[PDB]
């Protein structure tokens, strides 16, 4: 279980050594800000081994990837390029047919597998994934490598965990549906479906973030945002970078000027009461995604992923914050039957590119 | 592909015929009112023959099923019971692990597979499905039988259809997600997921009906029902028999007597203005489930199913109601990117026991 971030040239260097004389998978973790592309292999002892290189999404254009791909094929020895098993990338938008990606909230353009160089993407062994589809595959990869409790932590255990599992919560993904939520720049979501027939986990990409927010006792608050956006607020409007910024503006009331999502997270990490208020308000809405999806999708577990989640551990390790999220996760009419209480909430507690692992885990299936 | 209801006694006679020496699958369709149970064999020319018998759910308790099971085997040749290779039943409520079902709105008790006679339910070859889970399996079976266009009509074709498929809308299930909705007494919902990299369909049970309804311009209407229920309304509150009655009361305001949904639908078929206005309100909220799920679950198709939908066909043939349902289905902020327009809507136009044939279908996957 390991990745090494390299410059484009040292990447080329490493790929000629003895350990890399093995079959290889091309992977790309593409975001609205950067792309991470490179190769993956195994040694022995279930060993997950990757090295990639960062790219900036300069043009803010998903089609820029084609230029990166070419650059990689020529600038590298085809003795390596011929060891390429499969080609899997993920992108931050809806993807249909594993072949077409778009439209994107961040970038312009359309991701097209058919316009991809077949050296990095062998036909019949290539996919374009949604970013949270990739990450879903990554959660599965982490589980299979028996290393779950190294990367995820229980926030609170739900009723049903012990009905399905004797091992401790957080030690395994569990034999039930796992809902993956990635509250970052945008709000990502996938359902790791579990087929009780053959005991298989199956990643199902979702767009929960774009659902219109249903109310609690917060009609005035929603209407305030409604009036700024000129749009019925969806979950992502509250749970996102722009949402966090909004939460901050509502807290301060002109008393401090607006600052960025990033700045608000840093502030709260220093005990700023205003930013902390904003962080809680953000999490109140994340939890509403959880409780509605708890009913609709019936998960055994809910997992919060992303570097965002790892880095804000100051917020999660506070028991008053945890208790309030928990309160909001149970704030649903159906809780009078225990449905939201059934569910176990975890969060990623250690850095790991789930998407790259997932692209690789996905490539094994296309193989 | 074809069934026959028989008295318990004569069903027992039927199985003794040499054409029923085939391997058999025990199936069972359980609703709040009654339960139909029987056996399915396969025949000449890939034919599928089922014959079943009926049962009143008198105590309104799901455990009552065990009696019928026992009674089945006791008043039945153990010569023919030996032929049972698979047993599958559906029940009208949530189910975990294909083995534990409940509790149910319309019945009391808990369906447990472990309490069932292994003569009918052979371990490792048996399951409990949710009713829409079975329906989903049924919808798959109708498609593979090449008889889709016979039982389903296109309400309107969506944008993605001719891109993903080559055959006409309504003639196959399609290689894409299919959301099945059963707006009846309860609101049923399942998602027939499509894995684009093994070309395969998988049935994922859902409880969409219990999500809190997000607003449109209907804050007052929602507050009204809210006060009547002393519960935040969920979609099933607006879309159900109880919901249809409620819509009819808000129409007449006391000017005419209250009446059952069944009689409201009858009244609309005859052309009562009040009834037709209730029917439209009901459908306005049914379309909202669709609009919200279209975004959240990214389906290629949405299919309305059940005896209900066939019987109240009149409502769907009227091009005026259709253009209004279609308008409500596109009533979503995300439609500015064409997401609601993507989806093709279909209705069941001919009677069929999706659930019974769903049980058999599931049974085949289990062998
Ligand atoms: O971009 C969209 N949704 C994206 C998701 O695909 C992604 O999982 C998430 C995290 O990166 O950011 C969201 O903004 C999107 C586009 C069009 C319609 C609805 C949603
Ligand atoms: O009964 C429930 N849900 C049922 C569904 O499972 C069923 O598919 C549908 C059609 O029969 O009617 C709903 O009312 C139910 C019970 C408890 C919690 C959530 C849902």
PDB file of C-alpha atoms in Angstrom, chain A residues 215-217 333, chain B residues 212-213 215 218-234 237-238 246 250 285:
ATOM      1  CA  UNK A 215     -35.829  21.260   5.389  1.00  0.00           C
ATOM      2  CA  UNK A 216     -35.609  20.827   9.104  1.00  0.00           C
ATOM      3  CA  UNK A 217     -36.232  23.895  11.290  1.00  0.00           C
ATOM      4  CA  UNK A 333     -38.522  11.229  11.253  1.00  0.00           C
TER       5      UNK A 333
ATOM      6  CA  UNK B 212     -38.175  13.940   3.434  1.00  0.00           C
ATOM      7  CA  UNK B 213     -39.754  15.833   0.525  1.00  0.00           C
ATOM      8  CA  UNK B 215     -39.694  21.938  -1.496  1.00  0.00           C
ATOM      9  CA  UNK B 218     -45.392  24.332  -2.210  1.00  0.00           C
ATOM     10  CA  UNK B 219     -44.310  25.362   1.288  1.00  0.00           C
ATOM     11  CA  UNK B 220     -47.952  25.859   2.387  1.00  0.00           C
ATOM     12  CA  UNK B 221     -49.210  22.563   0.997  1.00  0.00           C
ATOM     13  CA  UNK B 222     -46.376  20.770   2.734  1.00  0.00           C
ATOM     14  CA  UNK B 223     -46.999  22.628   6.032  1.00  0.00           C
ATOM     15  CA  UNK B 224     -50.647  21.556   5.815  1.00  0.00           C
ATOM     16  CA  UNK B 225     -49.952  17.832   5.554  1.00  0.00           C
ATOM     17  CA  UNK B 226     -47.130  18.356   8.058  1.00  0.00           C
ATOM     18  CA  UNK B 227     -49.653  19.637  10.647  1.00  0.00           C
ATOM     19  CA  UNK B 228     -52.090  16.793   9.841  1.00  0.00           C
ATOM     20  CA  UNK B 229     -49.383  14.174  10.335  1.00  0.00           C
ATOM     21  CA  UNK B 230     -47.306  15.808  13.056  1.00  0.00           C
ATOM     22  CA  UNK B 231     -44.449  14.495  10.921  1.00  0.00           C
ATOM     23  CA  UNK B 232     -42.223  16.116   8.307  1.00  0.00           C
ATOM     24  CA  UNK B 233     -43.814  14.734   5.132  1.00  0.00           C
ATOM     25  CA  UNK B 234     -41.929  12.154   3.100  1.00  0.00           C
ATOM     26  CA  UNK B 237     -47.015  10.686   2.517  1.00  0.00           C
ATOM     27  CA  UNK B 238     -47.792  12.577  -0.732  1.00  0.00           C
ATOM     28  CA  UNK B 246     -55.331  13.959   1.331  1.00  0.00           C
ATOM     29  CA  UNK B 250     -57.592  19.762  -0.036  1.00  0.00           C
ATOM     30  CA  UNK B 285     -45.110  14.537  -6.091  1.00  0.00           C
TER      31      UNK B 285
END
